Amino acid sequence: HMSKKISGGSVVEMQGDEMTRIIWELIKEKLIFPYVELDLHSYDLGIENRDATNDQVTKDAAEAIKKHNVGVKCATITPDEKRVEEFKLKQMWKSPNGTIRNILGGTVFREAIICKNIPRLVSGWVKPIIIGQHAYGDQYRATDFVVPGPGKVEITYTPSDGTQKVTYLVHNFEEGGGVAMGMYNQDKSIEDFAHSSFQMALSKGWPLYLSTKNTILKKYDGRFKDIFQEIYDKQYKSQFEAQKIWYEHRLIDDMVAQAMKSEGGFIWACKNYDGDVQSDSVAQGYGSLGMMTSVLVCPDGKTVEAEAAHGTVTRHYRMYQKGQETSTNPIASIFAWTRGLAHRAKLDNNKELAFFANALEEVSIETIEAGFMTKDLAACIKGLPNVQRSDYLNTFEFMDKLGENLKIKLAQAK
Amino acid sequence: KKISGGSVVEMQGDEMTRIIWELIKEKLIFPYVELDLHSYDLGIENRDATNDQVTKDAAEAIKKHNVGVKCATITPDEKRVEEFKLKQMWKSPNGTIRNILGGTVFREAIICKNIPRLVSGWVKPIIIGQHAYGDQYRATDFVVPGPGKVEITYTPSDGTQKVTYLVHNFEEGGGVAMGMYNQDKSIEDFAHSSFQMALSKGWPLYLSTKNTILKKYDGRFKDIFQEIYDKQYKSQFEAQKIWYEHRLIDDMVAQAMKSEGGFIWACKNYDGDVQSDSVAQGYGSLGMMTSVLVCPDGKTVEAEAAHGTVTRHYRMYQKGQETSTNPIASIFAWTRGLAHRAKLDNNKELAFFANALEEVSIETIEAGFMTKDLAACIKGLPNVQRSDYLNTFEFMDKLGENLKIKLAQAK
Ligand SMILES: NC(=O)C1=CN([C@@H]2O[C@H](COP(=O)(O)OP(=O)(O)OC[C@H]3O[C@@H](n4cnc5c(N)ncnc54)[C@H](OP(=O)(O)O)[C@@H]3O)[C@@H](O)[C@H]2O)C=C[C@H]1[C@H](CC(=O)O)C(=O)C(=O)O
Ligand SMILES: O=C(O)CCC(=O)C(=O)O
Ligand SMILES: [Ca+2]
Ligand SMILES: [Ca+2]
């Protein structure tokens, strides 16, 4: 009969597109703002405000995250040919997440939210599997081109200090054309990636695996393997052993077979491409992309960006657009806010904010575990063809049910 | 009065698989099939002795006789170079052979009703066609020791202007860099092989790439497939009510996880290498898989046992200790090659024998006679007792008796 909200501090918010934008606003309206006062720095990364500002709004939000150390980002449209038409864009703008990653740096850690009544697709997975994706280099910064006919492709290195160049033959095309590409990574980026992985394994108490293909790329993938091993021996091995965990290198194909027959419960450090791909595989194996969280941990050990690990759910948004009922899972988006607020509360020693962030995570899981859930989770239980309308809640019924349970939980603890 | 078997190129391998290989031939093959065997030793010592020329000679012999069957082989790491005092950390024979022959490697689980799958919805099989040529498996990678410029250059053979592209200006330290390529003609054969596999199985075909990122490199795989599809295969796909689609690799691994199986999955060399191990494990046992390289000439094939050489079991066999080594992938390398041998020769007896041996293998396991690894797939290893499985020679022996019965019953 006379309450006062939690003062949450400074957070950078990146508004997004299509179905995740709708969810994003329901989360703020029903779960966050009634309990938490925020110093929000909002940036509209919607497809048409980006285009409006020649994508300057993306870069500015990236700089804002550097300044305030905490960002929460909604899924955004990444333009392709179709999208330039649909929004009559000025150009095919770069992915906002590549731009944001490239400015911030670091490792992207992805993890499924587990509810005990939600069957996995992979039978053995009891505990979670946290993939740490090295968010820099390799294919994502590579230079590729078409080879139009017979000829020589070479890759050369010219030292900056003046000494003589070295020239590696890629291929003599003798029979026609094809394609070629060069790609690189940097030692300091690999070192930051190793440290974040060892640190993540130690804070979760779980073992750590790095996957490469160094049997084939002895120099390129060998560099990753060597940097991890030296940093582990010099800096982490005795800590790992003190907690009865361990670090091992694995070939990527051995690693995906090992992961598939494990029980989970390990950190999986992936090079850029493998982490991009394998984390969608892992996400689906747990049940639903809607349940996949993601946090960019920057090398300063202080800045994070939290987001859902899925897209804008265009398919559902099209149905929403023509008045048709939808059942879109908000948990990944919710945990973007709770992870961002948890981190804000850690930097600030804000006890009430940290208790709120965890209460909302608990509430989300408890609601599903009591049998109230969106359709994608119902399908995990029954199999899609066998789901009845009575087995699940639509988008708005589920937020309402969550909002109801969160008011109860928070008024209980006071 | 044996079955006429014809010419077959055999590549001998290493450690436990080398041992099982000899047992397969003496127990299951040679008692029923007379063969003109052309045998190349790809054991790690002989590759070292010949500076790996024997691997090149084997691949050439496959061009000549059209059928190869390859035993698993050691791919040396640094511990192996010490063990054998190798002249260099030789590269996998599979890479050299695939580079010489070109083609597509089709991988598919070997399914036993009593071996549980780990992925719940995979009720039908998933066939991966891995492009066998180029990309990371023919690349050149090096260490960048400090600041400097990495560039990549194309010099046309006809003497016109060369083109140079900045890969990276290293300004803050060193790192690594690599160059890699593929060929139009080899991609086309990749496409043809995939469209033909789909049509022959009556299943739909998906090609995965990452063309959102590698717009030129992966875009070429995409454009080649689409062009060949529209001009040469779309009509026949529609007549069988199947289709072809390009999918982004990320989308596709998720789609496959939640799918029911029953499709052809065309993969670039790297993805096919990685996802075929994921898929074999998902169907229940990483080792229960077929791996058959189908060459562009449409006539030549090389079946291989895809797993490792089982070093721990070999050491135990060296010390004269009981082992329980699964032979099924080596057996199916023999049956797949002989089956294709029988196809080129219109040899109905050889074709019958190859499928019999495959059938005996499945039936024997489904009846409850299996090696320790398979019993552990069923009970869980901590719960496996000695009486739940056969040792290496007992299993081979049960296979041999069941095969002898199947061939007699059939006449
Ligand atoms: N972070 C972002 O800003 C991203 C935005 N995009 C965009 O999103 C739109 C559509 O893309 P899409 O392919 O449709 O993916 P998405 O995940 O939205 O939906 C797929 C299907 O997954 C099921 N599903 C997903 N979520 C839910 C849910 N909550 N509830 C229930 N079912 C769900 C549902 O399944 P169904 O119910 O249909 O069976 C759905 O349809 C495109 O514009 C992309 O640019 C993709 C990912 C990242 C970035 C992009 C980048 O940086 O370039 C990325 O990671 C990458 O690099 O690729
Ligand atoms: O890659 C090798 O060295 C051969 C073993 C292997 O991984 C395979 O054949 O798939
Ligand atoms: Ca991805
Ligand atoms: Ca492999």
Residue numbers in the entry:
A (entry chain A): 0 to 413
B (entry chain B): 3 to 413
Sentences from the paper on this structure:
Here, we report two αKG-containing R132Q quaternary structures (R132Q:NADP(H):αKG:Ca2+). These co-crystallization experiments led to a variety of complexes, with monomer asymmetry observed. Overall, we were able to capture snapshots of stable conformations of αKG binding ranging from semi-closed (αKG-bound) to essentially fully closed (NADP-αKG adduct-bound). In alignments of R132Q:NADP(H):αKG:Ca2+ with quaternary WT and R132H structures, the catalytic residue Y139 in R132Q was shifted away from the αKG molecule, with this molecule making fewer hydrogen bond contacts within the R132Q active site compared to R132H. In R132Q, the αKG binding site was shifted upwards towards NADP(H) and away from the substrate binding sites seen in the ICT-bound WT and αKG-bound R132H structures. Since the αKG-containing R132Q structures did not appear in a catalytically-ready form, it is possible that the enzymatic mechanism may rely on different amino acids used in the conventional reaction, or, since αKG serves as a substrate and product for R132Q, we may have a view into a product-bound conformation. However, R132Q behaved more like R132H when binding the neomorphic substrate, with αKG-bound monomers showing residue R314 swung away from the α9’ helix, precluding the necessary polar contacts. Interestingly, the closed R132Q:NADP-αKG:Ca2+/R132Q:NADP(H):Ca2+ dimer had an intact seatbelt over the NADP-αKG adduct, suggesting that a fully closed conformation of αKG-bound R132Q is possible if the nicotinamide ring of NADP(H) is stabilized in some way, such as via adduct formation. Despite the shifting of the αKG binding site, we noticed a similar compensatory mechanism in our αKG-bound R132Q structure, with a water molecule again recapitulating these polar interactions. Instead, a second water molecule was found at the same location as the Ca2+ ion in the quaternary ICT-bound WT IDH1 structure, which presumably helped stabilize the αKG substrate in R132Q.
